[PDB]
Amino acid sequence: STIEEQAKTFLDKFNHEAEDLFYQSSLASWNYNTNITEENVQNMNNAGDKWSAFLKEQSTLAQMYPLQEIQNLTVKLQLQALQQNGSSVLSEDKSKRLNTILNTMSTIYSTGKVCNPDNPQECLLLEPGLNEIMANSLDYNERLWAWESWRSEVGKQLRPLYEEYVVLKNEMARANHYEDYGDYWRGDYEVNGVDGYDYSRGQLIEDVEHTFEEIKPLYEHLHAYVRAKLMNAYPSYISPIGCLPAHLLGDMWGRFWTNLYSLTVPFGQKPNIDVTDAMVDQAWDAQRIFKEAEKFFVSVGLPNMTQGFWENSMLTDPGNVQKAVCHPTAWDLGKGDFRILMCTKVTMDDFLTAHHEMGHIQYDMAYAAQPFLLRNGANEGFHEAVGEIMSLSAATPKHLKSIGLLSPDFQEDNETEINFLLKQALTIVGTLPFTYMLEKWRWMVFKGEIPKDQWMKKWWEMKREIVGVVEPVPHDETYCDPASLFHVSNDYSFIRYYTRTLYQFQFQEALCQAAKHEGPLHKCDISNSTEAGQKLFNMLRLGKSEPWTLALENVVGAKNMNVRPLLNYFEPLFTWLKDQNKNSFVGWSTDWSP
Amino acid sequence: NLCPFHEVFNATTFASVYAWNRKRISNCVADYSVIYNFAPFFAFKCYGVSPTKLNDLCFTNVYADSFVIRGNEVSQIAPGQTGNIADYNYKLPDDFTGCVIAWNSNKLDSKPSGNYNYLYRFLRKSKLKPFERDISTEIYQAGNKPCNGVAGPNCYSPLQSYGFRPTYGVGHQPYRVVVLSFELLHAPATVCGPKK
Ligand SMILES: *[C@@H]1O[C@H](CO)[C@@H](O)[C@H](O)[C@H]1NC(C)=O
Ligand SMILES: *[C@@H]1O[C@H](CO)[C@@H](O)[C@H](O)[C@H]1NC(C)=O
Ligand SMILES: *[C@@H]1O[C@H](CO)[C@@H](O)[C@H](O)[C@H]1NC(C)=O
Ligand SMILES: *[C@@H]1O[C@H](CO)[C@@H](O)[C@H](O)[C@H]1NC(C)=O
């Protein structure tokens, strides 16, 4: 028996045992998320301990077979995923210190309650209070107070922990035969062994930078329009030539500009599209919503869902008798069990997110034939891109008219298309510069080529030039403003939101080209297109077996991130912006001084 | 005389696929209509014999192999198939004049705690042959180093379990499969169909 045959046998035994234990762990987690008790917490703890203890032993018995003696590619990928040392390279004391640091950071971010104003009796929490007062606020002083109060009390707590967390993560990454933790993270968009379809962990940086350079003019036009619209509401608070203050971007950290729509809608007289009224008047429930979504998927060509999905998914909150978190998530519990957990209201947003999680489920069933370690997207943006394709398609007025929520009396015009494209750009384009900024900063920090005594200095100077958001007040080095973000504090990769944004529009362009759709791309409908369904399914069924380069080419025809689908998607909006903001300055000055 | 056609289909427990149960049926009236009592039959393939002309021929013996597999492994119970059931657990010949009957048993079998009593074999030195049974549980060494007993780094005990929870998908649910194989040896046939 050769080393590769030994690897095959080991990987098969693994796949089986891992599938069993993963089903047990996922079922325990689903029981908890549908029923928050103490017995359910204990069940998750036991199942997760068993799963992690199995994964450690299987990794330490996978280290035996070297990769250099393996000629197969699927076996190579499975053993590469299984042999990952992870945090085991660190000593016991260092590993426990890192775990304690991560837990303390997560608890500080989650339980953070700030109480500067008046007596500490009045304090707000993340979800209802701080988000409610940051999303919809017209008070510059109040917004500044909230932003600087959260950035001061919290960041000062994370920074002493964050520096040592960075040191420990960099040490672990170096011990893992990498260059830094940034390289460890970039090792996900890496292909080695395939000729013609290969990727490098620095090639990702080059590609991301080139794509952002391509996207930049559209972002500058959108930024100028946003500043011009914000000026009318906010007098004497934003300069005509300078950048945009960070605390007035709707979100807590300015990740999304979606909430900045009431102050930026061009055609206020023209009503926006919304089908909530007709949806609730036509006696529509969660069952009907999901039945319509599965009808759309069947019309596209994808297979229907199991009868167990309907009887096991919890689509509505079961009242206050039992408490259950209803964050919309699609569950792939393993052995043929697909469930969706969400609190479905009769709303356009809930309909769209039902389509999104249903696309996630379709992706999960597509690669159900792949081995356990290859049951994932080609990279970490493919799943969200696949879901967002169907979210984009199901929101079109043509599809709404076809299904029945939109009356035929309604007409489509350039004003409506501009409103829809502006909302889409605020949601989608406005997050790409921020994501690229954050991941560039984190990569530079982990690489260590920059010094440590100017973390916030470099963070702010990169905010000025990349995203165009300025510091409302000066910040010293005791702050840790990047750590205030959930992904930064909880040790999460953030380039996935950059990559998925390009991938989803590439997929939409390819599928609409294969659906013989004529006209603008934003008015497309993948529905009733078995050709588009088959083309998407070809990439869907691959999973992680084929390299993401080949998976992208199998459905699109390109080999990397392309900005052209995004640009020709937003071409009508871009042309309208160019026509409209010609009398106002475009861009941000570098000479601004508070 | 009516031999246990009902007892094979209506049995409290069904054997594992790796060690399946074979019953030799002889000296009978045919009474194939007892088989058709069960409505939810997931598969009624009838390779080599008409599914309506069974009650006209005579065979020396009839074998009713009964076992439990997954839903996506039912397709491997057919002449010429390949997988893990068709070459390590239960292979049936290329000719195979007979019928394959399978129906879902997610209620009788399966258990929320995990029904690990139903096992299958996933490792063998050589592929199985038509109608062969491998009950031995000797550990299948992966390569280049004898285990001299117990399992280890590249040892690997061969039998693998199903688990069969009731929340599994349709292709991962238990399926009681009863395979009828008619034997036509050049001997006085003992099983015949009724006729006036
Ligand atoms: C949910 O938890 C409650 C808490 O006592 C208990 O009835 C049972 O464990 C679960 N019930 C249901 C209906 O899920
Ligand atoms: C790797 O092994 C699998 C075994 O199922 C096989 O299907 C595949 O073709 C092999 N890869 C190559 C490149 O031969
Ligand atoms: C799924 O859709 C198909 C349409 O091709 C239909 O025949 C089938 O009954 C549906 N099944 C479920 C469970 O919705
Ligand atoms: C898809 O085709 C069906 C049948 O012709 C039709 O009822 C439905 O409105 C179509 N949907 C779309 C979005 O074109």
Numbering used by the authors:
A (entry chain A): 19 to 612
B (entry chain B): 334 to 529
The authors write:
Since late 2022, XBB* variants, especially XBB.1.5 and other XBB derivatives with a proline on residue 486 (486P) on the receptor-binding domain (RBD) of the virus Spike glycoprotein (S) started to dominate, which demonstrated enhanced binding to human ACE2 while maintaining extremely strong capability of evading humoral immunity. Interestingly, L455 and F456 are two adjacent residues on the receptor-binding motif (RBM) of SARS-CoV-2 RBD, and the variant is just the “flipping” of the two residues, L455-F456 to F455-L456, also known as the “FLip” mutant. These two sites are also located on a critical epitope that targeted by the public IGHV3-53/3-66 Class 1 NAbs. L455F caused strong affinity reduction on XBB.1.5, but significantly improved the hACE2-binding affinity of XBB.1.5+F456L. Both L455 and F456 are on the core of the RBD-hACE2 interface, forming a compact conformation with D30 and K31 on ACE2.
